[PDB]
Design a protein around this ligand. Structure first.
Ligand SMILES: OC[C@H]1O[C@@H](O[C@H]2[C@H](O)[C@@H](O)[C@H](O[C@H]3[C@H](O)[C@@H](O)[C@H](O[C@H]4[C@H](O)[C@@H](O)[C@H](O[C@H]5[C@H](O)[C@@H](O)[C@H](O)O[C@@H]5CO)O[C@@H]4CO)O[C@@H]3CO)O[C@@H]2CO)[C@H](O)[C@@H](O)[C@@H]1O
Ligand SMILES: [Ca+2]
Length: 193
């Protein structure tokens, strides 16, 4: 299936690049998956003094049965990278809510290794409770700043990502956990470490 809307003005696609820093004002290869529930513009915005890829999202009040149907699902296609000797993939993730008081966001990471059926998903989903936010200190520009880490030795289905396993695509999903989130999201410094 494909989720479609009228043409949208994204920032320039650029070329797939890791670490993804967005400092060339391009998306560095990041784009919505064709199945992403969010298809609105991906632009490059300042976040916490650095250029970051960004989008707006307000989850539906009526929650879909499939937990990813309404989710931003952003993908770096055909990067064809490998983890090397890195234990983690990590990135800076920022929120600027206009509304956030209940439920949570569940952030998942997956890859598409051609040697592993084109899907390998990190086991360590990261949950951010929206009630935690009002107590968290914001950045100078009013964002909540997370640095999200995924242990690449914890992958579902007994699949193992070796140092040399080709990862054709990288996917990040920010799923709605029965939440009332509305506002802007941003990613930066997507990298292995
Ligand atoms: O845990 C957080 C959250 O989970 C929600 O449920 C998720 C579940 O966690 C996911 O595992 C599951 O993921 C599936 C994806 O939705 C689906 O798009 C992906 O499809 C892949 C397929 O696996 C892969 O084999 C296929 O490879 C093709 C290549 O891309 C082509 O290039 C090549 O030519 O052909 C191959 C073979 O077709 O690509 C497709 C597309 O990428 O499969 C995933 C695993 O099944 O999604 C669930 C949501 O639907 C849950 O809902 C939340 O409650 C929970 O918090
Ligand atoms: Ca940046």
């Amino acid at each position: 299936r494909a989720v479609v809307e009228a043409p949208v003005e994204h920032a320039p696609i650029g070329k797939a690049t890791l670490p993804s820093t967005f400092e060339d004002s391009t998306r560095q290869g990041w784009a919505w998956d064709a199945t992403s529930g969010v298809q609105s513009a991906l632009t490059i915005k300042d976040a916490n003094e650095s250029k970051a890829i960004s989008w707006e999202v307000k989850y539906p009040e009526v929650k879909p049965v499939d937990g990813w149907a309404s989710a931003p699902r952003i993908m770096l296609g055909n990067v064809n990278t490998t983890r090397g000797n890195n234990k983690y993939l990590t990135f800076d993730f920022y929120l600027k809510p206009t509304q956030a008081s209940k439920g949570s966001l569940t952030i998942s990471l997956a890859f598409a290794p051609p040697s592993l059926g084109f899907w390998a998903q990190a086991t360590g989903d990261v949950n951010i409770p929206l009630s935690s936010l009002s107590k968290m200190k914001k950045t100078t520009d009013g964002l909540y700043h997370f640095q999200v880490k995924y242990d690449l030795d914890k992958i579902n289905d007994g699949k193992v990502l070796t140092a040399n396993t080709v990862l054709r695509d990288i996917t990040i999903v920010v799923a709605d956990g029965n939440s009332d989130f509305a506002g802007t999201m941003y990613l930066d410094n997507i990298r292995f470490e």
